[PDB]
């Protein structure tokens, strides 16, 4: 909520991503904190298996309820950290309801 | 420029990409939003930081706000705690 | 300090170009035999496979730590 990205660049989510889709090269962010400089999904390799939302120990990467995001080009599917973070700056009213709705079962 | 630089040099040919297009860049930099937060004052020497949640936040780590010299910062939230 | 990953002989190939995809900045490559690490169980069985397939080899002898005698009391002498 504060506004601090939740991703702490564990690499616990490309070590499991079976389609080998994620590259999250990181640095100390100059606050002394630990965050990504790089994050990636190639959405033309991902399989919507959710092995990344259940491995994330912080609930940073999720897999939202969109399914109307077809694209006329190949480049609009190679998501970067800023098409996933403002993406997550969009559906957070709609994600958290579903997380709070299923957290117990998970 | 993204919160992590990335700004293409004027000469970079890698700029055509954005012609008749634009650049996906998040305006909400977490370097600053977290600085726009009140240092969480505490009474105890050590404090927890579940990430403001149990199982909906980040792993729970105890921070040693033992020296006023430094406000402990949970490595996960970047929240400074003022002893 | 686990020694379970230093017990079987591996046959890895040379390291060729690992470059950058202009569009996304990923690492790209043209070496089909780059991720190849065949695992054998003895020098003899690795040299055989390489000779079998027509590759050139550079065997490196094993380097087991020699025995170093350790005693608790020794650090109490004066």
């Amino acid at each position: 909520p504060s506004g601090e990205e939740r991703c702490i660049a564990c690499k616990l989510c490309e070590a499991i991503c079976p389609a080998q889709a994620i590259t999250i090269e990181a640095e100390p962010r100059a606050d002394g904190s630990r965050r990504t400089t790089r994050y990636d999904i190639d959405m033309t390799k991902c399989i919507y298996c959710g092995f990344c939302q259940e491995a994330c120990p912080v609930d940073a990467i999720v897999e939202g309820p969109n399914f109307e995001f077809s694209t006329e080009t190949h480049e609009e599917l190679l998501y970067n950290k800023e098409k996933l973070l403002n993406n997550g700056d969009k559906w957070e009213a709609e994600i958290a309801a579903n997380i709070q709705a299923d957290y117990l079962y998970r | 420029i993204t919160h992590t630089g990335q700004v293409y040099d004027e000469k970079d040919y890698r700029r055509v990409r954005f012609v008749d297009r634009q650049k996906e860049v998040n305006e909400n930099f977490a370097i600053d939003l977290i600085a726009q937060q009140p240092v969480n004052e505490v009474e105890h020497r050590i404090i927890a930081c579940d990430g403001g949640g149990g199982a909906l936040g980040h792993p729970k780590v105890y921070i040693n706000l033992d020296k006023e010299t430094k406000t402990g910062t949970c490595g996960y939230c970047g929240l400074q705690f003022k002893q | 300090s686990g020694v379970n990953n230093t017990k079987k002989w591996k046959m890895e190939f040379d390291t060729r170009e690992r470059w950058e995809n202009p569009l996304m900045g990923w690492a790209s490559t043209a070496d089909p035999l780059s991720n190849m690490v065949l695992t054998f169980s003895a020098k003899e069985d690795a040299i055989a496979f390489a000779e079998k397939n027509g590759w050139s080899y550079d065997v490196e002898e094993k380097k087991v730590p020699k025995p170093k005698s350790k005693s608790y009391g020794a650090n109490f002498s004066w």
Partner: peptide
């Protein structure tokens, strides 16, 4: 409870190398 805004990728990486810039004035 044709569009120009098309996502375009980056290499958000800080360029990971530095070339010697030659000396500005001759010798």
């Amino acid at each position: 409870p044709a569009t120009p805004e098309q996502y375009v990728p980056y290499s958000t990486t800080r360029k990971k190398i530095h070339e010697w810039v030659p000396p500005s004035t001759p010798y």
